[PDB]
Amino acid sequence: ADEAEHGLECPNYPWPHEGILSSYDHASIRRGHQVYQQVCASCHSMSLISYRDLVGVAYTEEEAKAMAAEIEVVDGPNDEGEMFTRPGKLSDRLPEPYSNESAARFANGGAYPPDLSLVTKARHNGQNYVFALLTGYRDPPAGISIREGLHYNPYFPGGAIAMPKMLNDEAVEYEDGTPATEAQMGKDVVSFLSWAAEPEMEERKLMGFKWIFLLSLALLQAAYYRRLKWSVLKSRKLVLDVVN
Amino acid sequence: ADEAEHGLECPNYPWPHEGILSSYDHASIRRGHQVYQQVCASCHSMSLISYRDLVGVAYTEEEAKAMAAEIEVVDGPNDEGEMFTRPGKLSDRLPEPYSNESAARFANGGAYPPDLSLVTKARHNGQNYVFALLTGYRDPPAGISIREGLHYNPYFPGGAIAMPKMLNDEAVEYEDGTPATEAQMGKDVVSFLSWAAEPEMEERKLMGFKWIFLLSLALLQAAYYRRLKWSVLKSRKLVLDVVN
Amino acid sequence: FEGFYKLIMRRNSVYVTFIIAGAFFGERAVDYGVHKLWERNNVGKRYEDISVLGQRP
Amino acid sequence: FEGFYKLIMRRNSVYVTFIIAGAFFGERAVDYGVHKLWERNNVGKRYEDISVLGQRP
Amino acid sequence: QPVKLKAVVYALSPFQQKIMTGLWKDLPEKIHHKVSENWISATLLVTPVVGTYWYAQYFKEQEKLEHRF
Amino acid sequence: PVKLKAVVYALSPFQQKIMTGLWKDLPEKIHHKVSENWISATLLVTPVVGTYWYAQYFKEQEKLEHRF
Amino acid sequence: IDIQAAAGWGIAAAAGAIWVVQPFGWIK
Amino acid sequence: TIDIQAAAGWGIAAAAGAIWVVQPFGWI
Numbered sequence: 189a190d191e192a193e194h195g196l197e198c199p200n201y202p203w204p205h206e207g208i209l210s211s212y213d214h215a216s217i218r219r220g221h222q223v224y225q226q227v228c229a230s231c232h233s234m235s236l237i238s239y240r241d242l243v244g245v246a247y248t249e250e251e252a253k254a255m256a257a258e259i260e261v262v263d264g265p266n267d268e269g270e271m272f273t274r275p276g277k278l279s280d281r282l283p284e285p286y287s288n289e290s291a292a293r294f295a296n297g298g299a300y301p302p303d304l305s306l307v308t309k310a311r312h313n314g315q316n317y318v319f320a321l322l323t324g325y326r327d328p329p330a331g332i333s334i335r336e337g338l339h340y341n342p343y344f345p346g347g348a349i350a351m352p353k354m355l356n357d358e359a360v361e362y363e364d365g366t367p368a369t370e371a372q373m374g375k376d377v378v379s380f381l382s383w384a385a386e387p388e389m390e391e392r393k394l395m396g397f398k399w400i401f402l403l404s405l406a407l408l409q410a411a412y413y414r415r416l417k418w419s420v421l422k423s424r425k426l427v428l429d430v431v432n
Numbered sequence: 433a434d435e436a437e438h439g440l441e442c443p444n445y446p447w448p449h450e451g452i453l454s455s456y457d458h459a460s461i462r463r464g465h466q467v468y469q470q471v472c473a474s475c476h477s478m479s480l481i482s483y484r485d486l487v488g489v490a491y492t493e494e495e496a497k498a499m500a501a502e503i504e505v506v507d508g509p510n511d512e513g514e515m516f517t518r519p520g521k522l523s524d525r526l527p528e529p530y531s532n533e534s535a536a537r538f539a540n541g542g543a544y545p546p547d548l549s550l551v552t553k554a555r556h557n558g559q560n561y562v563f564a565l566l567t568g569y570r571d572p573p574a575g576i577s578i579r580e581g582l583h584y585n586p587y588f589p590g591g592a593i594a595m596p597k598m599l600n601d602e603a604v605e606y607e608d609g610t611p612a613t614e615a616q617m618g619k620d621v622v623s624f625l626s627w628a629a630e631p632e633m634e635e636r637k638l639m640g641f642k643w644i645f646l647l648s649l650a651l652l653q654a655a656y657y658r659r660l661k662w663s664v665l666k667s668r669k670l671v672l673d674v675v676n
Numbered sequence: 677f678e679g680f681y682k683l684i685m686r687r688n689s690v691y692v693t694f695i696i697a698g699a700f701f702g703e704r705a706v707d708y709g710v711h712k713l714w715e716r717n718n719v720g721k722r723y724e725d726i727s728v729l730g731q732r733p
Numbered sequence: 734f735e736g737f738y739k740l741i742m743r744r745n746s747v748y749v750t751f752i753i754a755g756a757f758f759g760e761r762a763v764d765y766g767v768h769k770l771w772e773r774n775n776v777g778k779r780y781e782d783i784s785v786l787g788q789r790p
Numbered sequence: 791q792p793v794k795l796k797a798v799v800y801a802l803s804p805f806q807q808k809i810m811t812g813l814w815k816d817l818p819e820k821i822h823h824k825v826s827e828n829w830i831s832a833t834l835l836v837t838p839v840v841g842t843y844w845y846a847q848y849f850k851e852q853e854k855l856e857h858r859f
Numbered sequence: 860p861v862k863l864k865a866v867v868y869a870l871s872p873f874q875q876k877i878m879t880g881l882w883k884d885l886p887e888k889i890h891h892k893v894s895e896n897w898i899s900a901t902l903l904v905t906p907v908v909g910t911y912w913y914a915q916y917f918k919e920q921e922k923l924e925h926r927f
Numbered sequence: 928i929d930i931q932a933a934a935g936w937g938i939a940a941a942a943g944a945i946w947v948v949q950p951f952g953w954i955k
Numbered sequence: 956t957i958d959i960q961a962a963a964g965w966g967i968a969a970a971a972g973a974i975w976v977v978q979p980f981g982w983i
């Protein structure tokens with residue numbers, strides 16, 4: 189109606205990658221990727237991410253290879269002219285849960301689980317939005333009823349989301365030994381999603397600091413150079429006959 | 433040596449559409465389409481041609497509407513996310529005989545029957561070559577043996593072709609009643625293939641005759657204009673003092 | 677006769693109108709003449725000359 | 734600064750090589766320093782600092 | 791068309807003058823000048839923006855409270 | 860600017876015939892074109908024609924010798 | 928000379944519009 | 956006898972520039 193139409197505004201969380209010299213927490217990326225492939229991946233696609241993308245970020249070369257071999261990728265045609273199956277390689281994109289958008293809607297009550305490769309860039313205040321939405325399932329306010337098949341989430345615009353609560357406690361088991369609470373998995377999966385939206389952030393930030401510092405030095409020299417050239421004009425003494 | 437490598441040259445035939453003011457023979461185009469449907473289409477695709485292209489050229493709208501409806505085209509996905517089939521519409525292209533190129537080769541001894549949409553434009557002396565090759569299956573010269581699966585054809589380069597002779601008498605039943613001899617069907621099909629490669633020939637030819645006639649008249653006016661403007665200069669009498 | 681004639685060579689606006697009208701009619705006359713000769717040279721080869729036109733089965 | 738002037742600024746060809754060398758060496762010095770600040774500001778958050786790195790079953 | 795001028799101009803070499811210290815010379819008087827000449831201009835630019843923005847937040851707040859049961 | 864002393868008489872373009880001079884003195888025009896340009900025409904046509912007929916002759920001998 | 932020329936060019940422009948755009952059928 | 960010195964000094968500038976734009980330390 190009035191306030192539910194946009195939803196409830198998300199807070200500002202202190203993400204470890206926030207700050208002009210702050211990088212991603214790579215341990216939280218690897219942890220958040222396990223949350224994706226164990227909770228998210230059954231309904232959400234990440235079609236922009238390849239298995240080689242994780243090498244040097246969260247997984248080693250061998251780890252990412254064994255990861256891709258675990259999945260079955262279509263290929264062909266063979267010399268006889270049929271489509272076959274092969275183990276995934278590092279060049280292969282992360283697999284799709286459904287065959288097309290209509291299949292996704294048929295499996296999810298007519299609603300489409302959006303692709304999560306750019307979701308933190310595709311929403312306003314996106315990293316905080318995704319965290320607040322996932323951890324923000326609760327009971328609706330008095331006098332608000334939710335259609336069966338929908339769940340109340342004040343952070344969703346309109347307050348009725350086709351996503352069910354997916355971040356129940358201990359929904360995942362971590363490899364390092366971190367208690368996988370709802371808030372812990374919510375933090376880790378957003379670190380993973382944020383890196384997926386902007387994998388160039390670390391190189392971008394190292395470039396920005398380096399050159400803004402250098403261009404600042406050139407600006408001081410640019411000012412001195414301009415003032416050196418103009419000094420003969422600015423300090424000149426001009427004598428003229430006129431008075432008024 | 434090299435004589436077989438290039439192939440026997442194709443003679444020149446008096447095609448009814450040859451000539452600066454000659455149209456296609458539309459009755460032959462419609463007959464050559466029937467030859468395509470019943471002989472060529474088993475293994476040749478014409479993927480640049482659609483059923484709506486035949487309307488106004490060789491078939492009426494209802495004729496081509498019916499013809500599309502007898503074929504099945506993969507459509508979808510439906511609301512459940514699954515592919516289905518439906519009778520073809522005018523906008524549908526001509527059906528492919530094979531799923532992919534590898535499947536086409538596997539069904540033809542490893543040789544690929546090329547797409548026939550632009551064949552008359554894709555071979556040197558295209559119309560005469562396609563007619564001569566279709567009607568040029570004869571016994572090899574003495575001293576020449578053809579490996580199994582191939583057929584001798586002097587117009588085909590090298591001499592050994594993988595396409596069997598398929599233009600045989602009475603291979604097609606013509607609605608108009610003309611005898612479906614080998615030469616008749618070879619002439620009609622090349623007429624259809626000529627139109628399929630160059631469907632704009634008639635409009636292009638009518639524009640050429642009109643505009644070259646108009647541009648020639650503009651050349652006469654331009655010649656008069658130049659000479660009229662330059663006449664004051666070309667007829668002038670120049671008197672100087674010099675001699676040698 | 678003389679009225680249009682005198683106006684053409686005395687006012688450039690009338691002459692430009694005359695050019696536009698002559699371009700329009702001269703273009704259509706040639707297109708009509710070209711198509712008549714195209715029809716005379718292609719008797720029997722038109723889509724409307726197909727005997728079986730309309731009976732596909 | 735006149736002793737420096739006598740060796741490098743006297744000829745433009747040398748002074749140009751001085752600017753190319755300083756562009757090279759200055760750029761490398763800033764590269765190392767910015768990277769050292771990034772390492773010192775992000776302790777434990779790197780890919781080499783993943784404890785279970787290499788141990789995925 | 792050239793002008794016809796009569797004037798005497800004395801100039802000193804750039805390498806005989808201080809280049810940068812003039813930027814922070816009599817700094818307080820510079821700020822005094824900038825605020826003195828331009829306070830009317832700054833008011834005609836800042837007041838409508840801030841005033842219209844403040845009213846819009848004031849409108850939206852009240853309208854949000856009237857629709858609340 | 861060059862200092863030039865000359866007298867020029869010119870006639871209005873609307874007082875002379877514009878096109879008949881194209882076909883005037885034609886035998887002179889054809890004679891002049893041939894008599895001045897036959898060496899130029901020979902130096903351009905002979906090497907392109909001599910090379911072409913030689914290549915055709917060579918291909919005919921090469922084809923026949925490879926036969927049986 | 929000022930109104931006559933204006934009507935003459937206005938006629939030329941209208942004929943030119945009918946010549947470039949040929950809406951023979953929009954006379955409804 | 957300076958043109959030979961200006962040539963030698965501009966070749967050094969050219970060589971330093973080439974090593975600077977392309978930095979083939981991995982290839983040396």
Ligand code: HEM
Nearest residue numbers: 227228231296299300301302307318348349350351354377
């Ligand atoms: C931790 C696991 C998951 C995460 C992080 C995740 C993330 C997201 C995000 C970011 C959205 C976008 C919401 C928006 O557009 O504002 C979304 C929507 C949605 N998700 Fe997921 N998802 C997860 C698991 C699932 C699962 C397991 C399902 C199905 C069983 C699912 C079904 C949906 C649907 C249907 C929507 C759209 C709902 C609507 O627009 O009304 N999601 N999810």
Ligand code: HEM
Nearest residue numbers: 471472474475540543544545546551562593594595598621
């Ligand atoms: C009237 C019917 C057909 C016509 C007009 C036709 C036309 C052609 C043309 C123009 C070519 C290309 C020749 C070249 O490469 O220069 C070709 C090749 C070929 N055709 Fe057809 N075709 C017809 C029917 C068929 C049929 C019925 C088959 C198989 C049953 C077939 C199989 C092939 C194959 C395998 C080739 C490749 C030959 C090679 O590459 O050696 N064609 N055909």
